[PDB]
Amino acid sequence: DRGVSTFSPEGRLFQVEYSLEAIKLGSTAIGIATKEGVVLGVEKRATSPLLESDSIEKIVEIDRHIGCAMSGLTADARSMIEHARTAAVTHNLYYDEDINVESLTQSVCDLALRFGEGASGEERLMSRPFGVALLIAGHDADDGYQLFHAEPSGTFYRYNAKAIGSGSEGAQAELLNEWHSSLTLKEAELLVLKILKQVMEEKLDENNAQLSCITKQDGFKIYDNEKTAELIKELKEKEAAES
Amino acid sequence: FPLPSEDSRAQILQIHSRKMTTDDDINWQELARSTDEFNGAQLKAVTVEAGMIALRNGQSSVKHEDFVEGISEVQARKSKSVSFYA
Amino acid sequence: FATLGIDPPKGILLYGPPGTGKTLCARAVANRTDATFIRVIGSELVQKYVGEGARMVRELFEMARTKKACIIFFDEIDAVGGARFDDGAGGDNEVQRTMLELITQLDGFDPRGNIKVMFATNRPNTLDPALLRPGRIDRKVEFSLPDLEGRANIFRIHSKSMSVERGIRWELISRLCPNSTGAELRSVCTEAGMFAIRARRKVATEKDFLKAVDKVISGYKKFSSTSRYMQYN
Amino acid sequence: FRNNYDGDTVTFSPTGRLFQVEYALEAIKQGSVTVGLRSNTHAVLVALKRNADELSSYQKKIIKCDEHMGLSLAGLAPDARVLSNYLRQQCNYSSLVFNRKLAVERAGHLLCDKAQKNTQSYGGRPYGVGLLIIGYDKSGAHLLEFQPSGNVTELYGTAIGARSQGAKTYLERTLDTFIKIDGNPDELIKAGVEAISQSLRDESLTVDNLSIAIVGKDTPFTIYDGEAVAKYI
Amino acid sequence: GTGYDLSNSVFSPDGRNFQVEYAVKAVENGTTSIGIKCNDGVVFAVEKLITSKLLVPQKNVKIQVVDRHIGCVYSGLIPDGRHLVNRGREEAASFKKLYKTPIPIPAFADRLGQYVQAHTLYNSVRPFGVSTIFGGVDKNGAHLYMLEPSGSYWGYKGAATGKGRQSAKAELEKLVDHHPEGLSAREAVKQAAKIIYLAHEDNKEKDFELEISWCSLSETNGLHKFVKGDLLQEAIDFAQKEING
Amino acid sequence: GYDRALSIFSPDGHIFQVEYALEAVKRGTCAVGVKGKNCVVLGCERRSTLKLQDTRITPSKVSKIDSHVVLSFSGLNADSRILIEKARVEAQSHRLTLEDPVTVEYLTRYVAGVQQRYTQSGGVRPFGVSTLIAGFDPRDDEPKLYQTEPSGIYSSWSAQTIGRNSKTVREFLEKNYDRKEPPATVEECVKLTVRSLLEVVQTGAKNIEITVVKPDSDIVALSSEEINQYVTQIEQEKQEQQ
Amino acid sequence: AGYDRHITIFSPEGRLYQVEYAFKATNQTNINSLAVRGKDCTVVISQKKVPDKLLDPTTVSYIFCISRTIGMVVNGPIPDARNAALRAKAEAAEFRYKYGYDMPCDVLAKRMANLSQIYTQRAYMRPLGVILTFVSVDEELGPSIYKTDPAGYYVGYKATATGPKQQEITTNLENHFKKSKIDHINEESWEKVVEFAITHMIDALGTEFSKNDLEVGVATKDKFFTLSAENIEERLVAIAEQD
Amino acid sequence: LPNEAGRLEIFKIHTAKVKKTGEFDFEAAVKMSDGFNGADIRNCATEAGFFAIRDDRDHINPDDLMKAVRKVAEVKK
Prior knowledge:
It is classed as hydrolase. This is part of a larger assembly, with eight protein chains of eight kinds. Chain B has helices at about 5-15, 30-35, 40-55, 65-70. Chain B is mainly α. Chain C is α/β, with parallel strands linked by helices. Chain H has four helices and no strands. Helix content of chain H is about 60%, strand content about 0%. The longest helix of chain H is centred in the first third of the chain and has 14 residues, at about 5-15. Classes of the chains: A alpha+beta, B mainly alpha, C alpha/beta, D alpha+beta, E alpha+beta, F alpha+beta, G alpha+beta, H mainly alpha. At the E-G interface, helix 3 and helix 5 of E face helix 1 and helix 2 of G.
């Protein structure tokens, strides 16, 4: 085509504005940070009936007291393993404590978005800014639970309840009235699975999705297939008792 | 034809506004500062599309905001988009 | 128009992929106008003799002021306009003079009531940057890939005359289909109609639509589509 | 064929400018609307920043430098998390090495040629980020309006953003009154509140989305948020 | 396309590529800034167009004086004009490092022309689109050299730019017949405001502001001064004394 | 050297580099594999018809990382061997540091980690290499199968295969072959593998090669005589009409 | 594709389009000159145009002093003229640093031509189409003139000129060199040799000039100088007394 | 584009047409000519005479004539 330095008629890059199309091609995930814990989850779906969901990780862990997720291509998800996970350990290497979620996100965004045509000192060799939507959540030692997100455009915003993926248009619309300040951990476990039911194209299964949580004491803990199936049975019993 | 300046674009808009009915709330030096490198061909489309914004609102005459809405009309690619602003 | 002092738009530009529901909308609105419809293209417009593509068409422009209630859609402007650097390799001068002849009818005088101007092309700015200047185009038609829920009526329009099994869910069908156009959605139902030919389905089911998106868009479509061919120019 | 005079950084337009700067000038209106001025002894920066959702909050463009200086950038900030942080490093670099107050001249002089190196040296895009920087020294407060074209100047006050020209022109008559009144920073901040009401013709004044910065002689630099702006709403 | 607009590394039939020709229109669209070369020294002139009352006079100065002994002024684009200032003042500091002497005007001119000619050789390097006017006082005498955006520079007893470049120099030749060597340069300061006033007829839009930064062979003897106080309003009133209306 | 990037991000997500990197496997030979209890079997074929060479003198898909880990795939030839030598040095890098053999999980990440810099960073173009990675873990007899995409996407599989018309061949193992009930005897994995190899290459069994990965550093390569033993059993009950 | 208007590739005519435009117009400056060789000295004369009253005649020169014994003749664009001049002066000092003798004509003319020939290899960097003529007086061989062409052509020249009238003066000099059968001018008294070269210059022009309208210089034995305003005017007046 | 000797006979006819003051120097204007021809010589007093129309006088100063000489060199090509 032409030089990457070409902007939009509004003065923005093309790869930044077009980075939202690669997110819809990924998996739909909705994070929620309640008063008790922070609800994390994704959607594995299926690429085949012989697909194994045990060895695939769509939800990673940067540090014990925090968590992370991904929606998009899995290539950029490992770029923060050498950056976000390194910066979290670098903080413990210097200040030896839990990094603030508010400061960590902006610190990651410095290591997250770097690109361009070329530069001697900094590495601009990266072409596409992001191919994945990364979620950033955890607990702050001062404020509290904070749910942030790494956007494919590179910016960052404070999200009380965040929805990403292809179904983020219809899920976030109803999410306004669903999220409340009184929403607890147990009440938010059946709420996410109920929203993902209208999202997921197939029957809810332990291998078609993965959920986890962020605890201020035990830390990031994944939900095992035996435990995930329990939340599935609780959803079928809850939906039948609504009417 | 040189690039019309602030006071230059004002005198051009005064020609097409003779048949226009306004509320006398318009400042000529105010609208020209928001415009940059807009010739009389592009300045004429501002006064024409100004009343079209008030067409859906049922206004009897254009106002100072309707002339700003003329810039909101899509000519130079002034329309909206997604991401950074919403 | 006389009280406010504003005039309706005359010239208008159509840019986008080749008839994905852009051009379909252009011919649909013209039917509700209930006026004279005349189609003139730009490809045959070249010919040879000087004036065959300008003076002969000027007679149509002169008759437009005589006979009222006439609507003409200018077609194939890529064979008329376009930007030049060395000022042509020869033979395209009359092609460029026809572009300038269209300006003459809009130059001195012309009523906008009974005369309308509409172009068609695949990219907006490929014309002469002096041609695209306003006053022969009052408004531009921005045609791109719309949102998801907006196109939900397209699935309804094709299913109004189509027999579908009761209880089908269109929410999960639209999730398989990314951003697309109106004609690309009919191709999903077109192959879905072929699913009832070979496999011999009574009506259109949900499995036929869920598979067609992966069969058409993912499976059949593959390459050969317009993606990066429109930026500005 | 606008790809020649636009997509290329080193090319020159027939008017003598770069079309990449024209798109950067439009990015100011596409971003948040900010209002700032200089009263000398006191200085007020009122920046309204919209969010993407009712349950979402904006991100802070204003970056704290030192007690006697501050900066508020408008439009967008693609590279500002680097440049302004690198500039913030130069804020303390001048204090810890040269022991400088970092006035508005050299602070905008290095950034003037810095964005030009992207056009001069191939292999990089222009920054195209508007910067409004204010600082205090023995000569008083000074305002720096930094355009993507490398504008180095000093204004009593300016407002850039979407439909922010109303607050820019309307305050020129009372501009001499605002600068001559010192010692009452509350009324100086309220002067910028009226500029926000003139800049919003659609929605009303927000609470959490409003950001107000202040700097002065005895009063250091700080950002008002939450209950701090409750008296200014 | 033609290749001259996109690439400056090719050869034009007229010797000047179309890309270099675009730099001339950028300079003529700026603010008119003239120069004075006489027997008593070298006097510059600069004007700042006021777009609105928000602008503060006596702040922005386009005249960049290297040390006290060499003045310089540019036009057109601000960044391209100030890019040479950092390089011109760096070579002057490197000159006093090696030779421990002040740099003469002719030695200062070759450093400017080398940067323009080198940027036109590389296709990846964007050339300078601004014109440079520089002068001062050296161990020899008064010298004034203007660097064109193409890189060509030679001896000039007068300088002009912006609107009416060759029209503003017409008043300079009228002083040649009156004063063969220029004689007193103090009256030329008042003549500078009149030459700039000649361009104010067609270019009048809003209020104007004039600034003068000069250097002398006699009074300063290599030092640097500035026009302020009574000398500031005396030259302005002289330009309006001829034509009051 | 080259300061720019050899790849361009797509407006809709359709990337020229991702396009023809997958079809490089579609142009090349198929790589068939299936997991098991105590072992894993990896089959393959050859595009060349006339064979003047021997299987031992010319290696094709045969490569080794750990002692008990045999890694066989077809995405390409030259660009494929580059990632193998880097993996062997990386496999030694764990012996120079961790002193223990690396699990198959990271061996897939390292191959995709080099492909990560190709799709992200510029100055170098990505490959069309898609690796099917197998082998065991230290003191573990359970095999693993990971399908590595040139874009850096990997997932766990069982009967998955890549190559010419491999999506249709895999559908034969989606029903008769049960992932929940894997076979026990080593030869049982070969019976289902040979039947899947006749749907692409058909005749010309000289091109058919079978590599069985066994623990305790053992590799068994079946010959053409043992393959024909299962070919006769295919036409026994299939041709009979019940 | 195939056009040299940006990149440089071999044309189907066997001649580069860049080499064409370099050779086509060197006269865009619209100036003429001449170079001749005496017995023990060298005389060069260049036309000079001053289209302003504010121009300093001492500043404008097409003849720059390289070494003590070496002059130079340059015709072409002014900014690109000093590019080869500043390099040749820097390379002239390199001869003494490496050797400590005076720059001979066979070196300086070869170094600038080889540097210009490298530009044929480099497609990114622009060559120079400026006429380069290095004139001096050698101690052993006497006067020598080597004209460096932008394509790398340099050879011995008994006489040379510039502009479209170069071939007109060549015709008059060829008849005088054919009968005498000598390449240089065997006549002594270079003061009268300057007037001898002006006579051939007037035949091409047909008009007179002033002291500052003609750039004239004389390369003598172990010395090279530039005629001042009084030295030039003395010869233009004295030539009228003879013929 | 010859020297003064070529354009000298043109300047005589060019002078006899314009009625102005008896003090003029056209020798300096010869050097000022760049890319000018017999038609461009007529442009000199043509544009210079336009400045004296509103001045209610037909006299053309030598410096006012040279101002139009430079003006033709800007519009060349």
